[PDB]
Copies of this chain bind each other. A is one copy, B any other.
Amino acid sequence: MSELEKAVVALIDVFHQYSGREGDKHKLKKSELKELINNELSHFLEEIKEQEVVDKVMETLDSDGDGECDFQEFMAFVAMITTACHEFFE
């Protein structure tokens, strides 16, 4: 598989790594979201150390207002991070 295919599956994989830790095996609750960011986005995003920031990032990604981030919402987050990385380097 190509780099683009590898990327598509990596997005699926990281999501399930964190979402399947507690509660709804298919949604990132706040503590799963935090660890995903801290462990997996350490070169693109500042480490998250304050509850306020956990709350705020979820508030921002949670489009359907259920207090968790599901797969669709996670894809929106990846697009945001990707767009930011893109614009940074031109």
Say which size band chain A's interface belongs to: 20 to 34
> Which label, helix, strand, loop or mixed, suits the secondary structure of the A interface?
helix
A43-B5 contact in complex given A12-B85, A79-B79, A85-B12, C-beta closer than 8 Å = yes
Q: Is the CB of B10 within 8 A of A14?
A: no
Nearest chain B residue, comparing its CB with the CB of A39: B2
21 contacts across the A-B interface (CB closer than 8 A): A1-B43, A2-B41, A2-B42, A2-B43, A3-B13, A3-B40, A4-B36, A5-B44, A6-B6, A6-B10, A7-B7, A7-B10, A7-B11, A7-B14, A7-B78, A8-B81, A8-B82, A71-B83, A72-B83, A78-B79, A79-B79
